[PDB]
Design a protein around this ligand. Sequence first.
Ligand SMILES: CCCCCCCCCCC(CCCCCCCCCC)(CO[C@H]1O[C@@H](CO)[C@H](O[C@@H]2O[C@@H](CO)[C@H](O)[C@@H](O)[C@@H]2O)[C@@H](O)[C@@H]1O)CO[C@H]1O[C@@H](CO)[C@H](O[C@@H]2O[C@@H](CO)[C@H](O)[C@@H](O)[C@@H]2O)[C@@H](O)[C@H]1O
Lengths: 48, 193, 192, 46, 217, 367, 98, 75
Amino acid sequence: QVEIPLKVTKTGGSCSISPDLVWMDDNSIDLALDLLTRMKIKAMSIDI
Amino acid sequence: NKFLLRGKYKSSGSNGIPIGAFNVPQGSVVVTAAGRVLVEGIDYSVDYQLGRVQILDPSLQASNTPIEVSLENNSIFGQQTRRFMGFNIEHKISDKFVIGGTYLKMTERPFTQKSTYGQESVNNTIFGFNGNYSTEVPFLTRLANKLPNIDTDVPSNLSIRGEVAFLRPDAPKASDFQGEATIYVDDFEGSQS
Amino acid sequence: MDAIDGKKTGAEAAKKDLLPRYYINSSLFESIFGSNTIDVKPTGSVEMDLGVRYTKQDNPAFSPRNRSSLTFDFDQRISMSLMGKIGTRLEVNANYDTQSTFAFQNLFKLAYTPSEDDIIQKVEVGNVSMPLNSTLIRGAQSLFGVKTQLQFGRTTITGVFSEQKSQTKSVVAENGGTVQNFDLYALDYDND
Amino acid sequence: KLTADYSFSKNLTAIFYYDHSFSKAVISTSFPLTNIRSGFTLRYNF
Amino acid sequence: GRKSTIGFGSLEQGANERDREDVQQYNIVTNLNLGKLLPKKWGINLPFNYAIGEEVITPEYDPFNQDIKLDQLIRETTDQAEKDNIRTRAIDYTKRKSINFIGVRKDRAPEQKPHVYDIENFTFSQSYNQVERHDYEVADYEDEQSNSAVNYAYTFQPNFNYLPSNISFNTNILRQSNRQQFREVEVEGIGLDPLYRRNFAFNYQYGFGFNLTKSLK
Amino acid sequence: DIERPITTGVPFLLVAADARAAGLGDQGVATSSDVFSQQWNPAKYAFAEDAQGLSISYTPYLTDLANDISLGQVTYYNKINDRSAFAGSFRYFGFGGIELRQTGDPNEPTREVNPNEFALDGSYSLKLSETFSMAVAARYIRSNLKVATEEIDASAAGSFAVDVAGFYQSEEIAYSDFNGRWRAGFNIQNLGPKISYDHDDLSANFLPANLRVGGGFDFIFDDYNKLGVSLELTKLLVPTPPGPGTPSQSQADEANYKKYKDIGWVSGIFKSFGDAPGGFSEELKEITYSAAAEYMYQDAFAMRLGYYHESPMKGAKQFFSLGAGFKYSMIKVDVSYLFSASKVKNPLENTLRFSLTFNFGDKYETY
Amino acid sequence: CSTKNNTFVNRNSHALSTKYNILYNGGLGLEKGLQAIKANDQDNFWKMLPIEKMQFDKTKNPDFEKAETKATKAIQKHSMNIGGRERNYQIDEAYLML
Amino acid sequence: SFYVSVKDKTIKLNSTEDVMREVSIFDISGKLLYNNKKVENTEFQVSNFQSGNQVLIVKVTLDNGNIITKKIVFN
Ligand SMILES: CCCCCCCCCCC(CCCCCCCCCC)(CO[C@H]1O[C@@H](CO)[C@H](O[C@@H]2O[C@@H](CO)[C@H](O)[C@@H](O)[C@@H]2O)[C@@H](O)[C@@H]1O)CO[C@H]1O[C@@H](CO)[C@H](O[C@@H]2O[C@@H](CO)[C@H](O)[C@@H](O)[C@@H]2O)[C@@H](O)[C@H]1O
């Protein structure tokens, strides 16, 4: 499970919003799979 | 949905191995029995137009050993352009010693800049060295002539072939997003029919 | 000096015992191709279809503007092949069929094979191959491009730059017939 | 189907062709169809 | 003898098609013409084939969890028994043996009169194959096949006629043995109960043709 | 990649339709006179060495995918005097016969459609001086690529165009190491009224008006060996459509497209030039170029290398081309192949173009 | 490539061309002929053996003719005697082979 | 012996005594529009919007590596 809190694009004014504001880099998921492996190894020691 | 029915079935139909391709190019068929490469005139024969491979070795036929057949298939469509380049060196050290230095590169040209999962392009390079030493050993013939009822005269031969290869794979720069090799799990352009 | 001059009806025999500094003989000189003869010849047929196609389907739901279709029909049926030599050094083998199958049956091979004393031993243009006597590094048979062979005494260098027209395919066979593996899940029953 | 040959030479042949097909509708789910191909074909042998 | 590392492959193989495993394989095949050890006067064709080999495959990824590398998982275990189990269950080991005596027969003399009881009408074939395996799915796998074949054929050379024109006969002993002990991937303590498949067969067919009358058959 | 390509009607007119020019990087405006010199430069038909010539060219499309989808060309030329020549060419792009079938008792009669696109042109070339020639050509273009269905009208769209060409060929000039020859050429192509695919004047497409300017040199050694090096420049004479914005977001784009589409073809020819605040360098991005080298042995064997470069901003057609030519007695065979160097997939990749010409009649000496 | 201009590239190309593979083929012919002489059965053994075995202790072994032809082909068409001095440094090897 | 029929934007393959393994539908541009590796002699529903494109190419791979090619008009 990969979760990211989302920043909301500000609306109300013009319909046309620049792509850098439509697709914020703060909202982009960029996940290293080695982090998933580390989490899996750590959770091996966590009881259900 | 975690229970899996896994299996295999064998399809023969008629004599000869159906390799799944027709009009295979000559010299593109490689047959491997148990890690060793067979000989195209002794262990097996190839009927190229029908794509049939008939195993000739009596011991391999009654073996149950899985036989791997590799070939080139021209019956392809909708594939990316493949560029194949390289060079091969064949230095001759002596009358019975040859050394080689092959280098090869295949680059696939993707249709667009987006490579979806499964339809991936490669930019692979392979380079290696090989050595072939084929000598004649009359000592083996002399030893054979010391056997009870053997009075032969055919020459005895020895052949040693060594080879090392290195594969450096990559993806073409055309299917790169912001400088990284990218495979699209879902660009979402193919949904909503 | 009679052997050096050459025009004495017998000097040709004596030229062998001469120092090669004093004469030049053309028997061991060759042009870019071995001769000036042209022998590349065509064989086969070529067909032109030029005519009119007229169609009329009486579908009332169709627009009146689609009452009938009158088009020009043009068709080509090339069934040609080219075989021959240029100057006993260039070899040409080509085959073009419009009715052939998809992409590889139309062949074209130009093979330039110089004398044994040249550094360049072989040039190939068109349908070429790169056969390798290697198990780890496989070559390719179905290539279209340029293949060049160079020889420096005992070092042979073969370079290729081409497009591969085939795909490598592997099968596994036991006791003759090919083996097909299958993987189904419980949800994948034969439905309806 | 009408065809007419003429050998202009040993290698050159010209054929006039005329195919005319009319299918009349017997049931209303079929439409009357007229197909007329006509013209010439040139064959050169090597 | 072949030795390949993780990451090797062919030029055309993609990211998921290249070798995710270390391979160490060898195979020796020997062919002997044992019939040459006997005098050529009575020519015996007695070919002997002996093939041996084995391959060991070490996966890059642990077969359990399928996405953690084997070295990384072994490093982060801190338990000797668990480490040994993880190391041993990952190995895919295969060993093959084949002993063949196919086509044993005695050839005729250059000028020899065929006879119905001649040993030259017989052919013998022997085949033995053994496969020993152990990998992530099976802790112990053994496959044995034995094939003994004796073939006879004779065509006679020249109320109704009662001498057969031809006589055929061939016998076959086919024995297949399979032992499958599936592994407990968690602990190498006991394992599953071994399962045995046996296909011991004895086959024989015979046949003869008759030309009782010039028209009958 | 491709930013703002030029949109023209019947783009098939811009495809090379012979193996000889295809093997020379899709250029023929300044190459030696041949039977295919109608798409490239009709003015050199007056410089032909043979009196009459016929030619058949085949360019297959999607060879791996299907058959019968191809661009064919038939050319005929006849030079009557030593100064003038007539020519007629026919280019035909077709998908072949396609059967329209519903299941419906599969023995039922079926309708066959052949969506196609052809151009038929005739040219007259006249030699003005001993080294210069001009030519005027008239072309009729028809497009019938649509298939008639319900609520779809498949009426063919037609147009007419004119061609003005000029060709200069010098005499053999001796130099220090070789006695070469000079060639130059220009060709203004596809000058005609807009083609309306939907038969409405409000929705019309510019004809692909083109300008080709080229020059070449022949290195002649040993009287049996020739090396022709040719360079060609091409510019479309169609105005560039508006892009991201040229000062209400979509209103500006709509108004810009409205003003762009309401431009006459005659005025569009001049509007293609300039239309930029920058100088020659900024306009150089609309110029395609090609460089070709053709080795010729005994006038019977030909070996051709070519490079064609479009600016990746428009079109993205960059490739190398290989070609071979042979002449037996009066029959010439050309084959060409393309190696693409662009990101966009070239439709003519992995394709062998074929060409076959017959030469007959009198022979003319070359000045 | 001309033999009359003493350019670095011209001289080096001519030396490379005479070494590869005219002189290589000539040396192959020479060694093949030498091996043919060595593997002969013309040894008398009833008198003293010649110290250096020769072709005739006629048949005219063609490998030596091939070597001579290659040496001749190397000497002419690859000799660069531009200013009274030989520029090709492989020509003396060709004369030795001849 | 092979037929491809289009009635209402639906493609219908018919083979007499021949069973297909794979079907691929391409555009005139060469773009792969549809692909199914589990052909059952059934119908196919390709996306109806194709931006003015009517001509399609259907490639059928049978039991053996034989390939059947058919040009159809998408109606
Ligand atoms: C209706 C539509 C077109 C049909 C017209 C057919 C005309 C055929 C012309 C054949 C051609 C080009 C052929 C290659 C092009 C084919 C490409 C096809 C591609 C298909 C995809 C060369 O072909 C030559 O081949 C030679 C064989 O080696 C033969 O020589 C012959 O052997 C002996 C006989 O046995 C004879 O004694 C001997 O004298 C011949 O030398 C002849 O066949 C011919 O000369 C033309 O070259 C020459 O042919 C002659 C007439 O022969 C033409 O003279 C004119 O012809 C009519 C003018 O219209 C007039 O009537 C006529 O008055 C006038 O004299 C000229 O044009 C001339 O330049």
